[PDB]
Design a protein around this ligand. Structure first.
Ligand SMILES: Nc1ncnc2c1ncn2[C@@H]1O[C@@H]2COP(=O)(O)O[C@H]3[C@@H](O)[C@H](n4cnc5c(N)ncnc54)O[C@@H]3COP(=O)(O)O[C@H]2[C@H]1O
Ligand SMILES: Nc1ncnc2c1ncn2[C@@H]1O[C@@H]2COP(=O)(O)O[C@H]3[C@@H](O)[C@H](n4cnc5c(N)ncnc54)O[C@@H]3COP(=O)(O)O[C@H]2[C@H]1O
Length: 402
């Protein structure tokens, strides 16, 4: 039966690749592996030389991987994302120098640029009458797969007492299997821009006059340029708060699973907020950004190794508060946008957020710029979120006055 094969062999394989491609158990523990006894990097060498090229190359590969995903019909970039995740874990386990780890974060930004591959693959594959059910099953498989990767990464180092190098070998076994699964993915017969089955500047300029598309895209290019700077460097900060060498009380996987679990809760709890709290939208940003300005300052202030579990809660609540706004951000941006225009508005919001993130990494974090340590960067990121929270708060009172 063609309808029965379309669910028992294609949707069940879409969700299985959506589950298995997220399984990287040693992904939360990359930075304790770099700063551990195995690779033996200095904390001033990961913060200022290895991690700022995670933002440099992400600016370099965002425009190619956005165009090569639509031109190659979304499957070989899903194969390239698996083949770049292998090259990350190969350079983790075979590279010893800093240029190998700057090449490791080069390929890690190709995987970050190809996160747009899988969610836009389900759109061009599935018929639009059955798309929202398959995409609902597919996003519920990458949500379970991201959560159970960090749980499996946490249960091996803590319950199993597995070393970090043996964890990255288990993570290589789950990643070459994700390359094999990406070869058997059904290629879609259409795409969004270059391969269409069978104006956009006119539809953009009309929708650019919307008060919520201009507000929440200016949130996207400044708050996500500061959200993605904390999540690059909070694993270097936890190696300054509690610089342990146990590899069993590291707990970076439980903080990346609780930020997925709570982040899915606030993502779901923001579904009732996308339409109701839509006019009070500059005050809703300013309430969350000031919460993000205090949680980053709480990360920047905590220095005792006994208080490391305050730094885990100050990051789960940080990612849980950012994931309260995305739901509201993507709804108000993509409310009256065409789907071909929605992929380009989010394609330039993610690009201009990378433009800002490249500016702040070169000034604050890079050794060719200033080269601040990771505790002094987080004081600068806290004052970045504070002078951003008062801009939307003054905007909530300038428009609240009228
Ligand atoms: N409309 C929405 N409703 C509820 N939650 C939302 C949401 N949009 C984003 N989130 C949450 O924000 C996180 C990062 O979003 P970002 O768009 O910057 O980076 C995204 C984006 O580049 C891409 N992506 C996700 N969904 C997409 C979609 N429907 N269409 C195109 N690209 C998508 O994957 C990355 C991470 O997605 P992931 O969900 O694992 O992680 C997402 C998700 O948990
Ligand atoms: N992180 C992201 N990066 C770039 N673009 C993004 C994005 N998240 C959503 N978009 C785009 O915004 C459109 C409307 O988002 P909405 O949140 O209202 O309704 C969304 C949202 O509730 C949900 N959703 C989308 N991405 C999600 C994610 N990463 N995690 C959980 N739910 C997601 O699917 C619904 C329709 O998605 P669809 O693609 O057909 O249409 C989506 C999608 O193309």
């Amino acid at each position: 039966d063609p309808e029965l094969r379309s669910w028992r062999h294609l949707v069940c394989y879409l969700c299985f690749y959506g589950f298995m491609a997220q399984i990287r158990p040693g992904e939360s523990f990359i930075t304790p592996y770099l700063l551990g006894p195995d690779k033996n990097f200095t904390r001033e060498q990961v913060t200022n030389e290895i991690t700022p090229v995670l933002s440099y190359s992400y600016l370099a590969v965002l425009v190619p991987v956005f165009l090569l995903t639509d031109y190659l019909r979304y499957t070989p970039v899903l194969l390239l994302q698996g083949l770049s995740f292998v090259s990350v874990w190969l350079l983790l386990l075979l590279g010893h120098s800093v240029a190998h780890m700057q090449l490791m974060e080069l390929f890690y930004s190709v995987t970050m640029a190809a996160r747009i591959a899988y969610s836009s693959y389900i759109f061009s594959l599935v018929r639009p009458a059955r798309y929202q059910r398959v995409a609902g099953y597919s996003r519920a498989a990458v949500l379970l797969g991201v959560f159970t990767s960090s749980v499996l990464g946490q249960l091996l180092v803590t319950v199993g007492r597995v070393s970090f190098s043996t964890l990255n070998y288990i993570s290589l076994a789950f990643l070459t299997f994700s390359v094999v699964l990406a070869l058997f993915l059904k290629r879609p017969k259409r795409s969004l821009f270059f391969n269409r089955d069978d104006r956009m500047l006119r539809e953009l300029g009309d929708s650019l006059r919307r008060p919520q598309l201009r507000l929440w895209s200016l949130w996207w290019v400044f708050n996500s340029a500061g959200y993605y700077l904390v999540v690059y460097y909070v694993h270097i900060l936890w190696n300054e708060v509690d610089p342990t060498t146990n590899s069993a009380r590291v707990y970076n996987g439980a903080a990346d699973a609780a930020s997925t679990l709570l982040g899915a809760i606030t993502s779901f709890a923001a579904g009732f907020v996308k339409i109701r709290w839509a006019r009070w939208s500059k005050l809703l940003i300013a309430g969350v950004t000031a919460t993000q300005a205090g949680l980053v300052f709480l990360l920047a202030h905590t220095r005792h190794p006994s208080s490391i579990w305050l730094c885990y809660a100050a990051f789960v609540l940080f990612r849980g508060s950012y994931q309260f706004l995305v739901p509201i951000a993507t709804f108000q941006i993509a409310s009256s946008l065409s789907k071909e225009l929605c992929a380009l508005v989010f394609g330039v919001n993610t690009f201009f957020a990378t433009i800002v993130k490249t500016i702040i990494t070169f000034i604050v974090s890079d050794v060719r710029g200033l080269g601040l340590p990771v505790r002094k960067q987080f004081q600068l990121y806290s004052v970045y979120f504070l002078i951003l929270s008062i801009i939307y708060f003054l905007g909530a009172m300038l428009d609240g006055l009228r």
